[PDB]
Symmetry: D2
């Protein structure tokens, strides 16, 4: 599991469940090619987006559908979504956890990058 995304709800103090996201990889021609997608589980985590052999160096973009999460709780949040864009594996293969901590008018995103 070289890429995992974890989403937390800072209002309820709970995993953010059923949050959709779409991952892209920058192509050689500067275009965003679709790379992976899924939704967070009951623990707020999305595992299995990619594999070690597929997850080569590149610039990746994770678009997290935070607006639908809040709308489903009845709230019009501030942000349309939360995007995380990063270069991956520039110094060799790494395992990435992207964490997103969500409030209606604020979010934080952090990367925990480890070497297996």
């Amino acid at each position: 599991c070289p890429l995992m995304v974890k989403v937390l709800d800072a209002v309820r103090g709970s995993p953010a469940i059923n949050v959709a996201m779409h991952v892209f990889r920058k192509a050689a021609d500067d275009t965003w090619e679709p790379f992976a997608s899924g939704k967070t589980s009951e623990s707020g985590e999305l595992h299995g987006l990619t594999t070690e052999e597929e997850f080569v160096e590149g610039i990746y973009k994770v678009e997290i559908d935070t607006k639908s999460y809040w709308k489903a709780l009845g709230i019009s949040p501030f942000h349309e979504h939360a995007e995380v864009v990063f270069t991956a594996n520039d110094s060799g293969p790494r395992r990435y956890t992207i964490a997103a901590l969500l409030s209606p008018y604020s979010y934080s995103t952090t990367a925990v990058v480890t070497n297996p």
Copy 2:
């Protein structure tokens, strides 16, 4: 001043100075029309991006060049940039402060929305 962006450096505990950013507005055809740009001042703030007459309802995107900020300081950061995408003035005219708090591997963004 209906739109102000403020950028802080969580490593040094200081305003993030000379941070470039570009602002877009979603057009009727789903495309990002360029809207405004600037660099943060010595206080970490970028004022004067737009006016009340021009800052109509819409979806706006602020792309903050955090990567160049960190590179200039002797640190190679995780994120390529920090993007904030939001609907503005839906209810209607408001003043927005977008704050971004930057660390090399983490950032948070918050909106402070007031009614004059």
Copy 3:
């Protein structure tokens, strides 16, 4: 104004108004001498806590009554309060802005430290 505290509400996207806080300074005998107190204004800011002459080196503690803020709004929060403890003026006189960004189950605190 060598010490200012600013409190923001990440749920509503607004200054956190009428938030009480108490400031202490560690005495020579390791005890917390009461130092200053106040409530945030309509802008979420509390100014005038101390003066340059009084704000000497030391360890200071800011206790922010976040629980009463949330309770007053119809939310029972996780934290009893938000405490910020820091050494001040070690190198030497600085101006400090302490920012606290509040959610019911999460808060962040950052210091913006400048040299006049």
Copy 4:
């Protein structure tokens, strides 16, 4: 495992390893009785602080020694420590993860509270 504390380093994008912390519980007489202690492991997590039978309702305080973590990397950080104070189990037994995300001049703390 009804109480777990996880500490992350937002500068390096890594678990914060070997971070010491001390946990207290408010006694009937308003005094802080020592409750548990330990240090984070290689994953930045501290497990096994308490048990279900011991972890009764009460107000608990977690003092995280963030200053030593930064000093050991050569840095004089802003905060003396990071304290988290909360009422636990007021509505029945819950499992608590306290996460702390650390930068030299900023930290955030979030609670993820679940019902087994």
